[PDB]
Amino acid sequence: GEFCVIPKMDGQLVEKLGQRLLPWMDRLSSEQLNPSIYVGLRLSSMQAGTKENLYLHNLKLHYQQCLGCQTKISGGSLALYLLALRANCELLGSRKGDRMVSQLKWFLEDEKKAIGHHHEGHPHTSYYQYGLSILALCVHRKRVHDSVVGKLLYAVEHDYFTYQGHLSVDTEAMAGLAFTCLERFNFNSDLRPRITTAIETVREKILKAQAPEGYFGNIYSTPLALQMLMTSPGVGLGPACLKARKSLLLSLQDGAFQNPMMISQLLPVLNHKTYLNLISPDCQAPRVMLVPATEDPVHLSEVSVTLKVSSVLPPYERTVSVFAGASLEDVLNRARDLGEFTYGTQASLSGPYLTSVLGKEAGDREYWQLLRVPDTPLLQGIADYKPKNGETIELRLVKM
Ligand code: B12
Ligand SMILES: [Cl-]
Ligand SMILES: [Cl-]
Ligand SMILES: [Cl-]
Ligand SMILES: [Cl-]
Ligand code: NA
Numbered sequence: 316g317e318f319c320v321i322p323k324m325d326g327q328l329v330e331k332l333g334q335r336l337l338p339w340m341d342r343l344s345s346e347q348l349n350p351s352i353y354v355g356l357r358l359s360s361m362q363a364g365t366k367e368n369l370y371l372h373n374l375k376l377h378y379q380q381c382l383g384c385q386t387k388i389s390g391g392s393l394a395l396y397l398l399a400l401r402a403n404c405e406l407l408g409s410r411k412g413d414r415m416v417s418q419l420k421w422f423l424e425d426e427k428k429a430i431g432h433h434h435e436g437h438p439h440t441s442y443y444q445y446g447l448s449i450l451a452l453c454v455h456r457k458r459v460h461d462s463v464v465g466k467l468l469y470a471v472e473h474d475y476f477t478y479q480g481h482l483s484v485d486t487e488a489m490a491g492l493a494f495t496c497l498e499r500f501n502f503n504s505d506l507r508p509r510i511t512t513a514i515e516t517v518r519e520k521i522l523k524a525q526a527p528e529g530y531f532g533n534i535y536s537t538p539l540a541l542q543m544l545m546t547s548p549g550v551g552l553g554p555a556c557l558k559a560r561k562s563l564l565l566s567l568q569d570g571a572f573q574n575p576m577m578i579s580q581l582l583p584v585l586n587h588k589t590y591l592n593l594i595s596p597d598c599q600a601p602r603v604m605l606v607p608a609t610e611d612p613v614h615l616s617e618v619s620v621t622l623k624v625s626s627v628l629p630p631y632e633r634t635v636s637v638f639a640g641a642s643l644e645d646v647l648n649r650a651r652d653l654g655e656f657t658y659g660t661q662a663s664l665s666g667p668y669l670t671s672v673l674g675k676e677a678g679d680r681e682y683w684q685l686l687r688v689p690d691t692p693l694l695q696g697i698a699d700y701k702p703k704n705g706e707t708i709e710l711r712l713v714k715m
Contacts, residue, residue, distance in 0.1 A: 317548035319541060319556035321563070324585055328567040332578055332585075333361035334608040339575050340366040343373045345385060349664045350374055350392075350399035355579030357402035358588040362602035374399055382414055390422030391444030392664065394451035401593035407455050416457055423448050423463045430466045434473075437680075442470055442479070446489040453496035454593045461503050467493065468509045471516055480682065480715050483532030484524050488539040491517030492590055495546045499594065517543060522555055529558030533694055534566045538580035542589035574699045576665045614639055620646050621707040622656075623688065627673040631656065643685065643708060644697040666698045672710050680715045 339352055340363045353370050356363060363370075378396045381388045393415060400407060407413045426438045426445055438445055446467055452459060467490050470476065476486045494510050494517070497503050503510065521540045524532045531540035537559055544552050563581070572578050583589055616639040624631040633656070635649045644667065650656040659671035669683045670676060677683055685693040685700065688707035693700050702708055 316553035317550060319544040319548075319552040320587065321541070321556060321560045321585060324560065325564060325567070328564065329360070329585055330605075331608065332567070332572055332582065333359065333605045335573060336575055336578050336582075337363055337366075337605045337607060340370055343370065345377045345381075346662055348374055348377050349575060349579070350378075350395040351579040351664060352575055353399045354395070354402045354590070354593075355582040357596075357598075357600070358586060358592060359582035360586045360602055361582070361605050363605055371399065371403055378415070382418065386662070389440055389444060390419060390426070391440060391447045393419050393422070394444070394448040395664070397451035397455055398590060398593055401454050401596060402598075404596060404598040408457065416452065416455065419448055419452055420457070420459060423452075423459055427463050427466050434466065434469055434475075441486070442467065442476060443486045443489050446486065446493040450489070450493040450496055450590060453493065453500060453502065454590070456500070458500070458502045461506055464497065464503045464506055464510075468506065468513055471513045472509070480684075480713075483536040484521050485532070485536045485539050487517050487520055488536070488543040491521075491543040492539075492546070495543075495591055496594065499591075518549060522551065525555060525558065526562075528565075529560070529562035530566075531559065534562060534571055535577055535694055537563065538577070538584055541584040542580075542591075545584060545587065545589050546591050570701070574666060574695070618702060618704040620702040620704075621688075622646055622650050623707055623709045624672055624711075625709065626712040627675050631673060637702075639704075640701055642698050643693075643695075643700040643702055646702060646708070647697065660697070666696055669697055669710070672712075675712060677712060681712055682715055684711045684713045685709075686711055 336352060336356060339349070353367065353374060356367065374396060378388065378393065397407065397415070397419065408416045423445065426440065429439050430436050449459060449464065449467065471487065471490050479486070491514055494514050498507070498510055498514065501507070521531050521543055524540070530537045541556065541559060544556060566572065572581055617636045618639050618641070619634060619636050621632065621634040633650055633653065635646060635653065637645050637649055647656070647658050651658065657673055658669065659676070660667040661670050662668070669685070672683055685697070686709040687693060688709055
């Protein structure tokens with residue numbers, strides 16, 4: 316009863332999850348490649364055959380060219396690439412110095428300097444990318460200076476991620492995964508007392524974030540939370556993870572996990588694997604070939620949705636009709652079709668990220684928050700959220 320397991324998952328719901336990723340395997344441009352998709356598939360019970368090798372080949376070309384390149388690569392994006400390499404049993408820099416290892420180490424040094432000596436500053440990216448980058452170096456058997464690790468320990472020790480925009484456990488779980496890797500290598504040994512305590516702290520916070528329905532924080536934090544719990548057994552994990560199983564099953568029946576990044580975080584845990592398996596991974600794992608799904612019928616049913624923006628002058632409010640199952644992005648496009656509404660996005664590994672509305676671009680340390688009136692942050696982005704009839708969705712420019 317001490318191991319976190321997810322037994323008896325519906326086989327078809329899982330198959331459909333993998334089928335949703337399969338067509339993304341053909342989206343090979345620098346503008347759409349996502350190393351997390353490759354990782355998630357390799358750690359899953361499913362495979363895409365030779366499409367995987369072509370995906371990895373294109374990942375290598377993209378991340379090597381952007382050391383030609385069109386968009387700059389964040390530290391955490393490089394870290395996910397390092398995870399993809401481990402998923403193919405490849406190791407960087409075991410015999411010579413490696414540019415990518417150095418680039419990622421310097422990203423962390425830059426973020427450490429941004430945080431500052433009194434933890435009075437903030438990362439230029441996020442503590443999520445900070446922890447992800449420590450983890451990715453660690454699975455390649457690369458250590459970082461104690462001073463880098465100390466900043467993440469301090470944030471866990473002082474409940475730092477609560478202030479930040481998101482209030483769930485994704486960042487804490489990622490930090491725990493990083494710490495778990497450090498512990499297994501006995502890296503940063505002077506910090507070992509802090510590291511081992513922080514692992515317990517993170518596990519305890521995850522368990523306390525469990526809702527009666529069974530998810531940890533929210534349904535989309537639940538994959539990384541489950542990874543952290545799956546790294547090691549403990550009292551109560553069996554029952555806690557069985558509750559999470561029920562939450563995941565119901566969410567899948569309700570249409571959750573259509574987003575590729577989210578699918579890629581869920582697939583490993585459904586196969587009882589985590590990013591810690593990338594220290595010593597099976598590259599001969601048993602995995603069933605995916606086949607394309609058949610398209611669902613077209614619909615003429617409609618939903619009425621009100622779009623509201625109070626962060627601009629004059630404010631904006633318009634009720635539009637879109638087809639049922641249309642996305643929030645479709646609602647924005649309909650509003651733009653009908654009048655002077657405008658919006659802008661930028662690409663991310665999670666899909667389109669909203670960056671400007673009605674001519675107002677988010678500044679540094681600002682973002683456009685998506686809310687269901689009154690004041691309930693959405694759990695999905697514009698391309699994936701499917702508004703319900705009679706809802707009002709607000710776009711609000713907030714401070715990070
Ligand atoms: C950091 C972060 C943020 C930061 C990003 C800014 C920063 N300083 O980096 C802030 C707080 C601003 C943020 C905002 C949002 N986020 Co957020 N975020 C994360 C987090 C913790 C890590 C992402 C990351 O760095 N990944 C690694 C890097 C390498 O990947 P990347 O794609 O290059 O990272 C970028 C994108 O993640 C993007 N971004 C962040 N969140 C989201 C969400 C969506 C749907 C999209 C398209 C983009 C996006 O910002 C990152 C930096 O540029 C994840 C947790 C997770 N489990 O993945 C949640 C997560 C991705 N976010 C989520 C959500 C829902 C949102 C919001 C829609 C919340 C809201 N209601 O407004 C908004 C985005 C709205 C918009 N403007 O498009 C969900 C998405 C779930 C899903 N079904 O896809 C996650 C999984 C958290 C959760 N468990 O609920 N987020
Ligand atoms: Cl089973
Ligand atoms: Cl309309
Ligand atoms: Cl209008
Ligand atoms: Cl705009
Ligand atoms: Na218009």
